[PDB]
């Protein structure tokens, strides 16, 4: 006794649970993240690391 998946039968259903999203979860915005320069260029190391 389980639920037969409705996406594969013929006759069309007219009402079902849709996973919505509240006013807390927000998508595609910005972050006021800051930078801090390497201060001096002379003592940087790309060689190995």
């Amino acid at each position: 006794q389980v639920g037969i998946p409705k996406l594969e039968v013929d006759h069309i259903s007219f009402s079902n649970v849709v996973s919505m999203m509240t006013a807390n979860i927000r998508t595609g915005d910005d972050m006021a993240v800051e930078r801090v320069n390497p201060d001096d260029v002379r003592a940087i190391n790309i060689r190995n690391a």
């Binding site: 190391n45 060689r47 190995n48 690391a49």
Partner: protein, 81 residues
């Protein structure tokens, strides 16, 4: 080639090779050649060679593997080549 030239000439080079080290007291320490002399090659430019400049005592291991382990934890690096 003069068998006298290269015998005198090879000496002239081998003479002038010095690799940074620390004199130790403990009898259970072996100097790490391989990796240590590698640093002297580039010129101590690379960090794995710039680490051995500051504290050269990082090359004095008493147990194999533990030799390299230290030159990783103090770099955050995952592999030297």
């Amino acid at each position: 080639i003069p068998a006298d030239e290269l015998i005198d000439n090879l000496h002239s080079w081998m003479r002038s090779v010095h690799l940074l080290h620390v004199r130790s007291e403990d009898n259970t320490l072996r100097y790490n050649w391989m990796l240590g002399v590698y640093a002297r090659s580039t010129n101590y430019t690379t960090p794995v060679g710039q680490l051995v400049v500051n504290a050269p005592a990082i090359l004095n291991y008493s147990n194999p593997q533990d030799a390299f382990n230290s030159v990783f934890v103090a770099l955050g690096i995952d592999y030297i080549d």
